[PDB]
Amino acid sequence: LRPGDCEVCISYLGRFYQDLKDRDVTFSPATIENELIKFCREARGKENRLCYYIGATDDAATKIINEVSKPLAHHIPVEKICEKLKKKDSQICELKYDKQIDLSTVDLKKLRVKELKKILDDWGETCKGCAEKSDYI
C-alpha cells in the first residue's frame, strides 16, 4: 500500500496483465499459469528473481503461483496481488529496479562513478578521482 513497494512485482505483473488482454487470453488460472511461466523465460535481473519467488520457473518452486494466477483470474488489482504476496514471501517486495543517470549533474558519488563507467563497459584502470575518464567518454 506504500509508495515504491514491491516495485518490480507491481511493474512486471502489470505488464503481464496487460499483455494477456492484448493477446486476448482466456483469463483462467491454468491458462494464466502457463502464460506466466512462458512470460518468465524472457526475465533477467531482479525480474527473473521475481519469477523464481512466485514459483513461475522451470523446476517448479511451490504453488505460490496460485497466489498470482487465481486473484488475477478474478480481476483483483495487481497491487493487491503483490500486497498479499508480501506475507507469504518477504523477498518478493524486496525487489526494486536499478537507476540510470542522465547525467546532467556535477561531481556525483565517489563510488558511483565506477558503475557509470561500468555500464558503458570501459576500464577505469587504477584511478583515484577518475572523472577525467567519464567526462571524456
Q: What technique solved it? A: X-ray
Record the resolution, in angstroms. 2.8
Q: Do 89 and 25 share a structural domain?
A: yes
Angle at alpha carbon of residue 4, lines to 60 and 74, rounded to 5°? 50
Rounded to whole angstroms, the Cα distance separating 90 from 129 reads 39
Considering the domain architecture, whether residues 7 and 25 belong to the same structural domain is answered as: yes
Same domain, 90 and 126: no
C-alpha cell at 42: 524472457
Side chain identity at 76, as an amino acid letter? I
The tally of domains found in the chain comes to 2
Q: Are 104 and 83 contained in the same domain?
A: no
- Residue 132, classed as helix, strand or coil, is helix
Cell representation of residue 29: 488460472
The rounded Cα 32 to chain-centroid distance in angstroms is 19
80: DSSP letter? H
Cα–Cα dist 18/20, whole Å: 5
CATH of the domain at 14: 1.10.225.10
Q: Which of 96, 112, 128 is the last residue of a domain?
A: 96
Complete DSSP assignment for 12-58: HHHHHHHHHHHTT----HHHHHHHHHHHHTT--HHHHHHHHHTT-SS
Same domain, 44 and 68: yes
Residues 42 and 101 in one domain: no
For 85, the domain range is 1-96
Q: Are residues 44 and 86 in the same domain?
A: yes
Do 90 and 101 fall within a single domain?
A: no
Specify the 3-state DSSP secondary structure of 100: coil
Q: How far apart are CA 51 and CA 13, in angstroms?
A: 10
